[PDB]
């Protein structure tokens, strides 16, 4: 539910009102944040294991 | 005679629908257990938004006037209720009317309001409660629903009630 500095946290809200030229930088801020959140989860799970 | 406002005057800080959540927000609110000034009609200041509570039994208070200088050199909005329907007019009144834009005609007790002016919009929130006979603002907790926002692009820095009871005024602070 976090947006990581983008206009909104919903990926179907950026693609609904931004063209293919402006939405490249807004999507690529959500992908990086969600990737690092998943990586933090995997590191914590490895230490717990 | 100053009184306290205990857990009173909680409005909706935005217009986003959200349910079954917990929201931690930083906004202009009336702080809990804060001072309120009670009047049993001076030109009261309007610092950042007000909580205006009217404890009335025979409809003494009716409407407000908001302005900058309360002259005919500045825009001023009146929101009164002439016993039938509510009228809203923003003109250069002589506190006749000229050079003016907005107009809107729409068709013991405690009536409590929150007025907030931001981004050229005057937000008015309203709440109601069946008080018993007192001489003080009672404790409790009543949330305030949003009734209407007006596109009045003016500075509001003074206000003044319009009478034909008592009323309490408190100022909003960023908390």
């Amino acid at each position: 539910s976090s947006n990581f500095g983008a206009i909104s946290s919903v990926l179907n809200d950026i693609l609904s009102r931004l063209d293919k030229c402006e939405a490249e930088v807004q999507i690529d801020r959500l992908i990086t944040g969600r990737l690092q959140s998943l990586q933090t989860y995997v590191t914590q799970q490895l230490i717990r294991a | 005679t100053q009184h306290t406002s205990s857990m009173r005057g909680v409005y909706y800080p935005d217009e986003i629908f959200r349910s079954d959540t917990l929201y931690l927000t930083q906004d202009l609110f009336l702080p809990f257990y804060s001072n309120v000034t009670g009047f049993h009609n001076p030109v009261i200041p309007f610092k950042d938004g007000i909580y205006f509570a009217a404890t009335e039994k025979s409809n003494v208070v009716r409407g407000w006037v908001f302005g900058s200088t309360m002259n005919n050199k500045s825009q001023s909005v009146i929101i009164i209720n002439n016993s039938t329907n509510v009228v809203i007019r923003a003109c250069n009144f002589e506190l006749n009317a000229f050079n003016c834009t907005f107009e809107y005609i729409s068709d013991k007790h405690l009536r409590e309001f929150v007025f907030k002016n931001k981004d050229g919009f005057l937000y008015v929130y309203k709440g109601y409660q069946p008080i018993d006979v007192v001489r003080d603002l009672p404790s409790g907790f009543n949330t305030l629903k949003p009734i209407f926002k007006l596109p009045l692009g003016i500075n509001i820095t003074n206000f003044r009630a319009i009478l034909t009871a008592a009323y309490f005024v408190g100022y909003l602070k960023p908390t």
Partner: protein, 246 residues
Amino acid sequence: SGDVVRFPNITNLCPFGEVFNATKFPSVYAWERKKISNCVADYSVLYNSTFFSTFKCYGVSATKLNDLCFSNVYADSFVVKGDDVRQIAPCQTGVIADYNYKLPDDFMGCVLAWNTRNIDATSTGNYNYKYRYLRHGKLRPFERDISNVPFSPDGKPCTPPALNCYWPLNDYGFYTTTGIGYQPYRVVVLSFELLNAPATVCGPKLSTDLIKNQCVNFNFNGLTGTGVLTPSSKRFQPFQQFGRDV
């Protein structure tokens, strides 16, 4: 594999003939605000009549204004000169942004301005449109100050016959023999919201029948998505258009 497009029952066209083609726009210091509701914002019937020098949208994209659907739209109209069109923007300073008309930092809308020298300019001069150039402090966003009291730098009232007393409104002097930098321009600023309330004004997209239990691309009031559609037993508020999760 599929497309589902659902839009409300709106058929009226928005008043492009009364907001863009009017006999006189107001001055910049007394800009006029008008509400637009319950119509179909086409933007394609203007290709034959009105040619736009500036058309820039903030918070949305201009190519996506046909399949996006708004809640309420406000139009602010006024007249500036040629090189003051660059100050009708967020995050800007100057004489129009300070003392006449200020846009919010988090503005979401469209600024559109076009040149009118055939109707707003006269051979002898059109000294009707005025702007304010003296004021005690700047303006909060989306405010206006149509007062005409004389100005004194110390902060006391005076008579403009006396010294250090000035009238605070200058006249735009428009001619027919001057470059674009001092030629009249009509400006319209449109403000959108896109809330959860039911929609009033939006663009010309044809509707398609509902396809259920299939992986489709749907479009409900400008909400692009992908997924299967099933009948629901949920309970909404009377004003709600969608619901979300944790």
